[PDB]
């Protein structure tokens, strides 16, 4: 095996490869939302910018797992990236609710990754998960939650409130 | 003929003269909208500014065709500029819809100009049309489309949404 | 159809959607090469940096087609992104040769896109292809060709020449 | 006992004292390598600088455990520091391989320290180990691994490749 590998279980390595694929998939989903909101019949540039940045951050999150895999001596295995579940995301609120559900799904997978690492007594991997992923995931979920509440207050249906709330995101 | 003229067909020269007149006409239309929106009983300074700038840009577009005509050795022939189709433009949305229809009419004429130039094997004229007119025309049409959608979302009828959307244009 | 759509054929729109998928696939391939070259048993940081940048540029190329699709009033349809053909890329030379073949495949598709646009008399689309894709594609192919030749000169097999050439890329 | 001591097990305190000795020993080993590479018949100033810095970092690592011991109310007990296993380290590659083996031995001891702290339910000590030692240890092992691979590529035996690779370390 790798000259650097030490205390790195095959199950953790395999789970990192699946989390890489999931981060790339979330990046793709946010990319699809971003350019949905730049359609001439949607035209929500604040939502577009918010999801474009989220798309870039998830691709960075995938790359941090790829660097991690190499750092521990595991071998990266990239699978196909599934098409986003939708091609059209509805209103801003429906896209935010879809993003909320996605971030909670990613969070669930990360907590299962932490349980795998903890079960295999890998403190270096539990540290990565707590410092770089679990922390940022809980903050994202809180922020999307706040946004859903603010948009429901302003008026979530294709109206003045959605137009005003979209400026807060620009 | 002109000492500079070379590979410049009489039909292209004649079509440039008609496109000059159409650019000047569009400039006049936008000028009329601009000062319609500064009427004391309309008072939409953002729409006024948007259409004033569009008026200046179309006059520049006409001048670029006049410089082009002289550059190829054609002779500029300016006709009368017709009165704008309307003296009153309604709401912001109706003016935007009228501008959308006008920009698509100008775009149609430009594509017919490109077909004339292509039929006469004039690559220099097709380059001008692609670089200076077709590109900017498609971006304008997209921008007006976005604006129509945003104004429909904010509330297109003489109300708070039109007042708020008008500030985005200031 | 879209309020902005004009002179935009369904075949061009469909071909743009397939080119989007191909740009995303090339981005994924370069991402895989980039982190292959950061494996502790490869350790070619110059190749890693070169392919990481190429990965980012291809994702930008995909986004420019997505903006274009929206600008013309077409509708983006993103398919699944296939796994890279390889998980391990061999030497620097073999990765460069694989990138060369990939860039020529992308170039072939772009020229077929240009023929589709030209057949449908879409000068705006032929302009995009010439200005943003065909130009950059020919320069990339030339640059990779130069690099292959330089690496063959320095010594393409896992030796001092590959180590020295890798510093030129850092 | 100490006025500050709280939730600090005698076994953790004793294990910190042994890890202090091991950090000091590694510092001594790197010091020996550093001045081996400044011998007039070795003259590898890049390797010399790399090992001198590694020697300083390990002495800092020992001091951080000494500050930690005092912070928890444990009592520092310093033993004798053993002579380095070798007085002559061979080539750069052999010294790097010896450093790799040493860093993995230190890493093993640190993970056993983490198990001791975890068994005694000391979250403050597990945090220190993850944040200040396990993280840096895995990065060092990866870096030495990369260097071994790069030096094997450049030519690990007393030749041009070792001379060139040594400049990368300067
Ligand atoms: Fe993520
Ligand atoms: Fe114009
Ligand atoms: Fe590309
Ligand atoms: Fe240390
Ligand atoms: Ni996030
Ligand atoms: Ni609704
Ligand atoms: Ni509505
Ligand atoms: Ni315009
Ligand atoms: Ni009305
Ligand atoms: Ni009203
Ligand atoms: Ni390229
Ligand atoms: Ni070979
Ligand atoms: Ni070799
Ligand atoms: Ni170190
Ligand atoms: Ni030897
Ligand atoms: Ni020798």
Q: What is the helix/strand order of chain A?
A: HHHHH
Helix content of chain A: over 70%
Oligomer: part of a larger assembly
The count of helical stretches of chain A stands at: 5
Please indicate the percent range of residues of chain A in DSSP E strands (runs of 2 or more): under 5%
CATH architecture heading of chain A:
Up-down Bundle
Give the N-to-C terminal Cα separation of chain A: 49 Å
So, the CATH homologous superfamily of chain A? Answer: Ferritin, core subunit, four-helix bundle
CATH first level of chain A = Mainly Alpha
> How would you sum up the major sheet of chain A?
none
Describe the overall structure:
- This is part of a larger assembly, with 4 copies of chain A (170 residues).
- Chain A has one domain: Ferritin (Up-down Bundle).
- The first copy, chain A, has 5 helices and no strands.
- Chain A has helices at 10-36, 45-72, 92-119, 123-154, 160-169.
- With 170 residues, chain A is mostly helical.
- The radius of gyration of chain A is 18 Å and the shape is elongated.
- Bound molecules: fe (iii) ion (4 copies) and nickel (II) ion (12 copies).
- Residues 54, 57, 140 of chain B line the site of one nickel (II) ion.
- Chains A, B, C, D: Fe(3+) 3 binds at residues 23, 58, 103.
- Chains A, B, C, D: This is Ferritin.
- Chains A, B, C, D: Stores iron in a soluble, non-toxic, readily available form. Important for iron homeostasis. Iron is taken up in the ferrous form and deposited as ferric hydroxides after oxidation.
């Amino acid at each position: 095996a790798s000259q650097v590998r030490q205390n790195y279980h095959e199950d953790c390595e395999a789970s990192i490869n699946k989390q890489i694929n999931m981060e790339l998939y979330a990046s793709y989903v946010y990319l699809s939302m971003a350019y949905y909101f730049e359609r001439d019949d949607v035209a929500l540039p604040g939502f577009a910018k918010f999801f474009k940045e989220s798309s870039d951050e998830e691709r960075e999150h995938a790359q941090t797992f790829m660097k991690y895999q190499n750092k521990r001596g595991g071998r990266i295995v990239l699978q196909q990236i599934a098409a986003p579940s939708m091609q059209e995301w509805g209103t801003g609120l429906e896209a935010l609710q879809a993003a909320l559900d996605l971030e909670k799904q990613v969070n669930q997978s990360l907590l299962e990754l932490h349980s795998t690492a903890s079960g295999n007594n890998d403190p270096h991997l539990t540290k990565l998960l707590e410092d770089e992923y679990l922390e940022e995931q809980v903050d994202s979920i809180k922020k999307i939650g706040d946004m859903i509440t603010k948009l429901k207050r302003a008026g979530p249906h294709h109206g003045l409130g959605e137009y005003m709330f979209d400026k807060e995101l620009n």
